[PDB]
Design a protein around this nucleic acid. Structure first.
Lengths: 50, 873, 834, 166
RNA sequence: CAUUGGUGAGCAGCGAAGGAUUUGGUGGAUUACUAGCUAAUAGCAAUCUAUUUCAAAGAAUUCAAACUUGGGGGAAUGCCUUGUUGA
């Protein structure tokens, strides 16, 4: 972090790496921020994934 | 005389009208009170910064001003007002028709002298009262006693004596007893000024023939006599800084300084103020300081300072001459032209008959400055031709300003009286520019205009030729020759494509500035006197000779509106920033506001003095006008900026004697429902449907990720124990028997009463009204709380209520939402007992209505299919 | 046309000061830097006032009537504002650092905490006309020995409690006759008294101190005097009280600590109701609704705003904004929503009407440089300096794919195929353009030919060519699709900084380092126009600069440009204080907009006050952190040379006014500009301007109404358009019966067709007449469907607005209708038993 | 401004330190300026060392020793946020106290931290030396005055002389 | 032959009781104008201080208090912590 800030963020990106992420089925509204509106009401997992 | 759109705000550019100013001290600091027509202003002596102005204008012009600590006394007609911080605290009304002339305040006694040689004395009701209010007595000086009163003075260390100074001689009255203590010996010359000296028992008297007398009141004899032959004393003042100096101001505009100890003249300041406006009307040394404040009738207030001597010894002999320290000023004669310098209402440019161009600030007076007339050295290298004696440029008839290239090169053009060229100025430097634009046809300049880009300047000559110069290099580029008489107006649109001109021959020329072609020519009935072009709307108005304003559209070159009603020449007019109003001033002393959309006069004013100029602020908040009398600029506030104005035409006959509501206020409110057969949504936020359907999921998102920590020992009824308001469904009280599940009579909810009432009355209109008003949480709670047990009366009634609502075709989106919540909460109940006749019949009737509202789907599908096809292929 | 006005500020919900609820409780007033933003939570609408302080706002208040708003900056400069008219009544300079201002509950008086003095003034009448000195002083009180931290009014407007840094709280009487009733000083606090309040009965006075002690004061026998009957302590380990508020009716005490956690207490019992944490940053301000149900907290460091419904333990509002971070913006294809990319690495989707962030994405590790939608709009793409390009699916908010170069290149610019099948990114260190396949995620190829870093990219919507520019002083048009690969380089006089593609796809404009906007014909590859912009640009002198703004060449160019969808205008911005709107065909400046008037920003002023300059240098450049009382404020974490990419504490230099991105609204005559303070949105919505079209003497508002009375609806409608008055068009529009709509629609002149379609799109979105508006659209499309097709780019924004109404509101209604129909059939038809 | 002033022990030289960081050393009787620093920083107090030749300034975070002409000689990294400065003339010790609640004695002759004492009473509100015995008196926010010597880790005496900060 | 190299001698043209270049000092602006001091619901502004004191209130086991240190290795004697011995 310090070296990046010092170099004004002109660094060279770190080598690409792969990781595994777990996605839990949930209503799409829950993922959004908290206010009196929602963007999408679909589910977070596609029919193939179910 | 009262406008419904505009109200006076203040007067800009005025510092003093010539009435002697008053100096008051608050602690160590000093302040000066100056008179401005029917109002006064207070300046800080250290900075000459405006502090206060009188809250309201007096009925008559102020004749005298005296200030003591916080309180200021202003005399006008037969009344003396007492002001603190510019706000009137008490008004003293004298009982005689004679007007007040002079005003003196010492101790608790207020002395006012009227023009009939009557002196009124007022006294404080209480010794600790701030100002005198009670009327004590009246002393009148008769012709045998003395001449006309010249001034009222009080000498220090005199108990209850008022030193009345008359043209003939001086008189000493005892105000407490009202008796003449002493009469001075008659003086040969008329006394004009009096000033108490810093020495005891001595008052300095100035005569009409340049004599200053140090009269000793105790001894009743002359002590000294200074002679100033062929001069008239107007002011006197002593220096209190330990140097025995005396300053004598004269009506010729000169201020002489004498050294009383040495019997010598220190210096003379020549022509500090104009003789034609009264010379030096007031000159006062600041108490205990080397600073002297001077004023005159030329609308100027100056300060001079005596520097310390340059000699290490004999400093009293080697006296540095007084040095100018600071000053404030304005025009000496009424402004001839005004304009707004910037998009904001910060600065204004004003030109006057006194041959000076000023930049006045609305935001702060100290920022006001005079634009310099120092000339730039010629680029060629030849000597510029002019008289060695420097004189100001002639009066400015027209002015044009742009800000697209401010700071890059010249951005102002001005036309002068009886001059065959136009001068340029620079707003950033505040100095005359280096270019001069000539008509090149031996004619005087009558019109000046600038392009919005700031690259071109257009000059209209009295011989009918329009020359076009470049502002950066001052090189003539193009010359148009269509008019044969004087060109009284030139304008170019924002796009710099179409140019318009007007002249005294009555024709309006339309040119293509890009291609230099004549697009068309329009002839009007009468000669055209002025033009104003509105760049946003491409409309321009022409003040014709027949007392009309003709509005023309440049795009189509046709007259769109014509305005009638002025009874004399139209001096000036302007467009409102939104392009919707025209305010015009005429020589018949009326300012009329015209509404272009309807083309009628909506407002009218009657001004005491004819308004020569009218200008809107580009913001639209202020209207500036200048009048034939007065050195300032009148600023008005646009009340249309804080409330709507009716556009009903003003009464013409009524206005002469002094000398559909939605359409009137330019608004329209949409109907609740255009037609009964038409589906109409609810009048409210469109998110209400989505919130009601998805209330739970929205709320689970709302909950914090971690449970708040709470005290174990917590009141169980804390929410109810609230000292008293909350209007939630929870905070409902019953309104006034066998047990009933839904609610026992006397203990049932408001909603259940209306539902039962509607079922009997066969009308749920009352219930539907309260459903729409219910908050989303309340609505879900009521539907969930409906009775779900046999005979299922409440569910049947609720379905009947919703079915009636769908018949109305109003608020249908909500009735659909309520039905969806009914299925969500009681769908299993309906499914289990679907065969029940009561539920089935209610459901069937709902379906019959609901089946009709499918036409909305057909419309929605068609529009997308075509809209997608139209936009794509 | 070019009549744009500042409408609202997105991207920031709170910067500093105190947030106030409206008296009704239905609106929240939040200071956002130099301006005040008002959010209506129930109606889901927001607006930002146009007026502007010269420094950041410090204290605000709205009177109980809701008619007058007073806002004060950090110098004491105050502005009185008519809340209903949204206009400024007066400007007042109190010549000191006013910590708090509060209207009396009557509304007649308001009090000021200016240093060690309490100033009581008389409220100007809102109905009265503006005058030179509207305010009238009532009294000045000088009893405190140090600065007043806060003040509180009694419910009856008769007493004022003031708390100062003197470790003391003091009470004053508004009426001189009642001075003996309340002339007491409350001592005994170890630290600054943060707040002092009355009980509902007004017989108990509570005082709170920074150290974390609450004292209960009562008038009791030891003959009677105020005494501390009880003392309560917040046993916060090291957190200090930062703000306090009390609601007498509900006896609720909300205290915000410097650790970032707030507690709700019930007085006088001192029962802990709840304890939550909004983060690690101090809670700077706390406010209570009038009913006592909603509590609003704000944290200045991250610009968080939080409304908490403590009863149900729910969040009405929970938002966080950006300052000095927004690198890019993108409109949704329907124009409803706007997306932003920030140096934090977070992508946020903001609702234009509401003013709140709908969603946040935090996958990127480093600064996100660009964002762009596909032509469809469902999908979004973003590039970042961490070396990745990520695709986002807005239906499910998943990062369904991530593209990365083989050799670890930072990406600064991005472009997406209109078919949404190819994605291209450029860099400032590689000189090549990477191309990926969206379906596969594989790197298709690396376009080469530039001799300098690629500054910008753009696909054309129709012909589908790729236009790239570089600091190589050249522009290259790539025909990537097709059997043959062709490149057409065009030379330019100077380095190209920005590039915009015409909606037609036939021309491309580029902003150069010389301050020029040059337009080229893609097919012929020849210049067709040029606009000179160096003189238009306003660049200010920085406090640290040793050279004038005129001679400064720091930013006399535009780093971002965008076209209008009609194709006739360009909006440009850069690292300067001006947003310039040009007209392409005539090559003229339509209008220029000043980005900021905040002296807290560095590039605002062209000339700096010579009083600040001294023999040492500018007084502004002197660092006064050591004066600050808290250790956190004094600490200096600045890296010696950093310019961007870190938190504000790292820079050590003042923020500089700049615009990072600009775009036109696809569905309205508005544009949005990402700047340091936030997303400025300029719109023409107000339309107070009188802009008639083709008037004659016979056309008048009265004649229009007469035509309706005579049932000449077509003539009435056309005459309304010629006047171009919205109220008249609306009046005529709703007076046309349904039977005669198709007759009128077929006969409307082609000249006024774009105007009616624009009116419907704006009117329909918020109107209740869903069926009436759909009938009109059906008649207009059916009658003039062919004409709209022949001129796609003249009708583009009007058409997009109509589709938004048909899809965002009309569909949602029928969708709720149709499921009820199926839910109905299942319940009746199926068998429910057992 | 504001300006904190310190005179030399013999009264011949005057040291003024402005809060915004204007520090000047002068012979006020002869009107001669020995040094003038325009440190763009927050300066709290300054003091002369054994004579007018050297003086110390307590800046934003560190104390600096300067020369007669104003050349910086040392940056006292060990003294952090000192708000009060004192010099014991016969012992050649420089004494500092500030927001850290730490009393530090520094030998100017050798340049070695003689002792650092933990006051345990928060920021130091006031400080004064007893010229008779060179015992330092510190006032604290709790209203107590404590007497200190470099050779004792705990205060010699504690006096309760106020109900608030001293 | 060219100097857009320097230094000079002179014209044409410009041209009203002279013209050009440089420079010290002060004043007004450089943010949007509600006045000075104090012990401040009022006094003072020529100050009182010969009523300026009393009374009342006011003291957290927080009895906690370096969020403040360039890296590696140690620290005899110090300092901190823990235990322990004898009073």
């Amino acid at each position: 972090y310090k070296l990046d800030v010092l170099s004004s963020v002109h660094f060279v990106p770190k080598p690409a790496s792969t990781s595994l992420e777990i996605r839990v089925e949930t209503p799409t509204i829950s993922m959004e921020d908290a206010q009196p509106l929602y963007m999408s009401n679909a589910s977070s997992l596609a029919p193939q994934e179910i | 005389k009262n406008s419904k759109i505009f109200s006076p705000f203040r007067i800009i550019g005025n510092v003093s009208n010539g009435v002697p100013f008053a100096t008051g001290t608050l602690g160590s600091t000093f302040y000066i009170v100056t008179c401005v027509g029917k109002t006064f202003q207070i300046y800080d002596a250290n900075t000459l910064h405006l502090l206060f102005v009188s809250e309201k204008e007096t009925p008559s012009s102020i004749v005298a001003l005296s200030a003591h600590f916080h309180y200021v006394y202003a005399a006008y007609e037969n009344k003396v007002g007492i002001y603190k911080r510019g706000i009137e605290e008490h008004l003293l009304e004298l009982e005689t028709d004679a007007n007040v002339e002079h005003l003196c305040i010492f101790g608790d006694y207020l002395c006012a002298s009227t023009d009939d040689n009557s002196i009124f004395i007022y006294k404080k009701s209480d010794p600790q009262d701030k100002y005198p209010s009670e009327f004590y007595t009246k002393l009148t000086v008769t012709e045998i006693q003395g001449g006309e009163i010249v001034s009222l003075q009080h000498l220090a260390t005199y108990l209850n004596k008022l030193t009345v100074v008359t043209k003939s001689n001086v008189l000493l009255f005892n105000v407490r007893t009202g008796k003449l203590v002493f009469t001075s010996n008659e003086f040969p010359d008329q006394i004009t000024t009096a000033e108490p000296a810093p020495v005891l028992d001595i008052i300095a008297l100035g005569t009409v023939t340049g004599e200053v007398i140090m009269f000793n009141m105790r001894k009743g004899k002359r002590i000294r006599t200074i002679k100033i032959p062929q001069s008239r004393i107007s002011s006197l003042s002593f220096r209190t800084d330990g140097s025995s100096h005396l300053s004598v101001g004269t009506s010729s505009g000169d201020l002489i300084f004498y050294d009383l100890d040495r019997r010598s003249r220190i210096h003379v300041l020549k022509n500090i103020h104009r003789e034609s406006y009264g010379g030096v009307t007031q000159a006062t040394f600041l108490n205990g300081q080397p600073i002297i404040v001077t004023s005159g009738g030329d609308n100027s207030l100056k300060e001079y300072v005596f520097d310390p001597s340059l000699s290490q010894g004999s400093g009293d002999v080697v006296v540095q001459p007084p040095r100018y320290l600071r000053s404030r000023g304005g025009h000496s004669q009424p402004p001839s032209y005004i304009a707004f310098a910037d998009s904001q209402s910060h600065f204004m440019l004003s030109a006057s008959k006194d041959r000076s161009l000023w930049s006045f600030s609305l935001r702060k007076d100290a920022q006001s400055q005079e634009m310099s007339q120092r000339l730039h050295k010629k680029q060629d290298g030849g000597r510029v031709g002019g008289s060695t004696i420097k004189s100001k440029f002639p009066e400015i008839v027209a002015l044009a300003i742009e800000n697209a290239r401010i700071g890059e090169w010249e951005n102002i053009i001005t036309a002068h009286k009886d001059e065959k060229f136009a001068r340029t100025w620079d707003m950033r430097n505040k100095r005359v520019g280096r270019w001069t634009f000539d008509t090149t046809d031996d004619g005087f300049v009558k019109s000046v205009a600038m392009s919005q880009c700031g690259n071109f300047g257009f000059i209209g000559s009295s011989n009918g030729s329009i020359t076009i110069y470049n502002m950066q290099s001052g090189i003539l580029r193009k010359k148009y020759k269509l008019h044969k008489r004087a060109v009284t107006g030139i304008s170019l649109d924002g796009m710099n494509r179409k140019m318009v001109s007007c002249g005294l021959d009555g024709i309006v020329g339309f040119y293509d500035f890009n291609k230099s072609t004549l697009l068309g020519k329009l002839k009007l009935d009468a000669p055209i006197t002025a033009m104003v072009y509105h760049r946003s709307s491409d409309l321009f108005a022409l003040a014709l000779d027949d007392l009309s304003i003709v509005v023309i559209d440049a795009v189509t070159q046709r007259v769109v509106r014509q305005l009638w009603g002025h009874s004399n020449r139209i001096t000036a007019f302007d467009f409102s920033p939104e392009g919707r109003w025209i305010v015009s001033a005429s020589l018949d002393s009326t300012i009329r506001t015209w509404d272009l959309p309807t083309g009628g006069c909506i407002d009218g004013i009657i001004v005491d003095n004819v308004a020569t100029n009218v200008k809107f602020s580009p913001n639209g908040d202020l209207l500036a006008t200048t009048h034939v009398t007065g050195n300032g600029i009148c600023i008005w506030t646009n009340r249309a900026q804080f409330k709507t104005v009716s556009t009903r035409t003003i009464d013409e006959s009524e206005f002469a004697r002094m000398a559909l509501n939605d359409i009137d206020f330019n608004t329209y409110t949409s109907l609740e429902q255009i037609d009964k057969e038409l589906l109409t949504l609810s009048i409210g936020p469109r998110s209400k449907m989505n919130t009601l359907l998805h209330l739970d999921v929205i709320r689970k998102r709302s909950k914090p990720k971690e449970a708040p920590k709470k005290s174990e020992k917590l009141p169980f009824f804390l929410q109810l124990s609230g000292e008293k308001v909350r209007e939630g469904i929870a905070h409902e009280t019953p309104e006034e028997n066998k047990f009933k599940v839904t609610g026992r009579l006397g203990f049932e909810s408001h909603f259940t009463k209306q539902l039962r009432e509607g079922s009997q009355s066969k009308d749920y209109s009352s219930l539907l009204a309260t459903l729409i008003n219910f908050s989303p949480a309340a609505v879900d709670l009521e539907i969930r709380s409906l009775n779900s047990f046999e005979p299922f009366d409440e569910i049947v009634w609720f379905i009947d209520a919703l079915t009636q609502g769908l018949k109305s075709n109003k608020n249908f989106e909500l009735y659909e939402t309520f039905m969806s919540l009914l299925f969500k909460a009681h769908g299993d109940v309906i499914h289990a007992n679907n065969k029940n006749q009561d539920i089935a019949s209610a459901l069937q009737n709902w379906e019959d209505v609901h089946k009709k509202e499918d036409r909305l789907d057909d419309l929605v599908k068609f529009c997308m299919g075509v809209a997608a096809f139209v936009t794509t292929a | 046309k070019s009549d744009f006005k500042f409408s609202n500020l997105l991207g920031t919900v709170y910067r500093q000061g105190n947030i106030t609820f409206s008296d009704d409780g239905k609106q929240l007033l939040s200071p956002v830097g130099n301006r005040v933003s008002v959010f209506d939570l129930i109606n889901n609408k927001s607006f930002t006032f146009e007026y502007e302080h010269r420094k950041n706002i410090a204290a605000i208040d709205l009177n109980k009537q809701g008619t007058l708003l007073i806002s004060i900056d950090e110098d004491g400069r105050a502005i009185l504002v008519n809340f209903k008219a949204r206009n400024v009544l007066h400007h007042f300079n109190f010549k000191e650092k006013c910590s708090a201002v509060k209207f009396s509950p009557d509304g007649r008086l308001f009090a000021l905490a200016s240093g060690r003095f309490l100033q009581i003034w008389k409220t100007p009448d809102v109905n009265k006309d503006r005058q030179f000195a509207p305010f009238v002083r009532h009294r000045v009180h000088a009893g405190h020995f140090q600065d007043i931290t806060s003040l509180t009014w009694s419910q009856d407007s008769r007493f004022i409690l003031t708390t100062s840094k003197d470790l003391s709280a003091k009470i004053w009487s508004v009426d001189s006759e009642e001075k003996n009733l309340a002339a007491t000083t409350f001592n005994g606090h170890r630290d600054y008294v943060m707040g002092a309040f009355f009980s509902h009965d007004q017989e108990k006075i509570y005082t709170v101190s920074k150290d974390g002690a609450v004292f209960v004061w009562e008038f009791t026998k030891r003959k009677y005097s105020w005494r501390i009957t009880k003392k309560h302590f917040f046993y916060a380990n090291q957190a200090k009280v930062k703000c306090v508020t009390f609601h007498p009716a509900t006896r609720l005490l909300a205290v915000g600590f410097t650790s970032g956690e707030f507690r709700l207490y019930d007085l006088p019992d001192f029962t802990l109701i709840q304890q939550l944490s909004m983060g690690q940053n101090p809670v700077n301000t706390v406010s209570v609704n009038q009913t006592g149900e909603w509590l609003a907290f704000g944290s200045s460091k991250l610009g968080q705003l939080l409304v908490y419904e403590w009863q149900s333990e729910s969040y009405i509002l929970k938002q966080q904004g950006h300052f000095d971070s927004t690198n890019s913006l993108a409109y949704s294809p329907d124009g409803s929503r706007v997306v932003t990319a920030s140096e934090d690495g977070k992508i946020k989707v903001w609702d234009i009407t509401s003013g709140f962030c709908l969603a946040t994405f935090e996958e990127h590790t480093s600064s996100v440089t660009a964002v762009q939608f596909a032509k469809r709009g469902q999908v979004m793409f973003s590039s970042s300096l961490d070396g990745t390009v990520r695709a986002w699916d807005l239906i499910r908010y998943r990062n369904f794919r991530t593209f990365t170069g083989t050799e670890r290149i930072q990406f600064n610019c991005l472009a997406v195929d209109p078919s949404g099948e190819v994605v291209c990114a450029g860099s400032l260190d590689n000189f090549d353009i990477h191309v990926w396949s969206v379906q596969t995620g594989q790197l298709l190829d690396a376009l080469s030919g530039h001799e300098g870093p690629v500054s910008c990219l753009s696909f054309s919507q129709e012909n589908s060519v790729l236009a790239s520019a570089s600091w190589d002083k050249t522009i290259r048009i790539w025909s990537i699709f097709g059997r043959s690969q062709q490149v057409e380089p065009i030379e330019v006089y100077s380095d190209v900084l920005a590039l915009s593609m015409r909606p037609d796809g036939k021309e491309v404009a580029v902003s150069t380092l010389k301050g020029q906007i040059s337009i080229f014909n893609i097919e012929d590859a020849k210049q067709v126009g040029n606009i000179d912009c160096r003189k238009d640009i306003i660049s200010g002198r920085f406090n640290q600069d040793r050279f004038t703004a005129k001679n400064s060449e720091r930013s006399k160019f535009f780093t971002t440009i965008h076209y209008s969808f009609d194709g006739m205008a360009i909006v440009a911005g850069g690292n300067n204080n001006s947003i310039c709107l040009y007209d392409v065909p005539n090559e003229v400046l339509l209008k220029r907009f000043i980005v900021s008037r905040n002296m807290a920003l560095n590039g605002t002023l062209e000339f700096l006050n010579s009083k600040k300059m001294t023999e040492a240098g500018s007084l502004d450049l002197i660092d006064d952190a050591g004066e600050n009382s808290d250790l956190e404020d004094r600490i200096d974490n600045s890296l010696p040379g950093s310019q961007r990419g870190g938190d504000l504490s790292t820079r050590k230099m003042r923020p500089e006014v700049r615009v990072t991105s600009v775009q036109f609204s696809p569905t309205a005559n508005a544009f949005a500009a990402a700047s340091t303070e936030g997303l400025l949105i300029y719109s023409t919505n107000d339309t107070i301007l009188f802009d008639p079209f083709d008037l004659d003497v016979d056309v008048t508002p009265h004649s229009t109404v007469e035509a309706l009375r005579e049932k000449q609806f077509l003539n009435a409608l056309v005459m309304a358009f010629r006047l171009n008055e919205e109220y008249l068009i609306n009046k005529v529009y709703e007076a046309i019966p349904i039977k005669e709509i198709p007759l009128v629609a077929s006969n409307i002149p082609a000249i006024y067709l774009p105007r009616i379609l624009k009116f419907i799109g704006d009117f329909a979105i918020e109107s209740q007449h869903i069926e009436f508006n759909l009938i009109w659209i059906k008649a207009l499309l059916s009658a003039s469907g062919g004409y709209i097709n022949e001129h796609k780019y003249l009708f583009s924004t009007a058409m997009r607005s109509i589709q938004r109404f048909i899809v965002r509101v009309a569909k949602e209604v029928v969708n709720t209708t149709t499921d009820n129909k199926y839910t109905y059939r299942f319940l009746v038809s199926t068998d429910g038993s057992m | 401004g504001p300006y904190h002033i310190k005179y030399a022990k013999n009264g011949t030289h005057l040291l003024i330190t402005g809060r915004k960081g204007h520090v000047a050393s002068m012979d006020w009787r002869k009107g001669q300026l020995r040094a003038e620093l325009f440190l763009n920083e927050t300066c709290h107090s300054a003091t002369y060392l054994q004579n007018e030749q050297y003086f110390a300034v307590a800046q934003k975070k560190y104390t600096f020793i300067y020369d007669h002409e104003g050349t910086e000689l040392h940056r006292l990294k060990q003294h952090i946020e000192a708000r009060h400065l004192d010099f014991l003339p016969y012992h050649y010790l420089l004494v500092t106290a500030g927001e850290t609640g730490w009393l530090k004695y520094h030998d100017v002759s050798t340049g070695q931290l003689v002792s650092e004492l933990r006051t345990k009473a928060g920021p130091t509100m006031a400080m004064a030396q007893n010229p008779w015995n060179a015992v330092m008196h510190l006032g604290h926010s709790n209203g107590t005055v404590s007497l200190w010597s470099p050779s004792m880790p705990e205060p010699l005496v504690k006096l309760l002389s106020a109900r608030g900060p001293v």
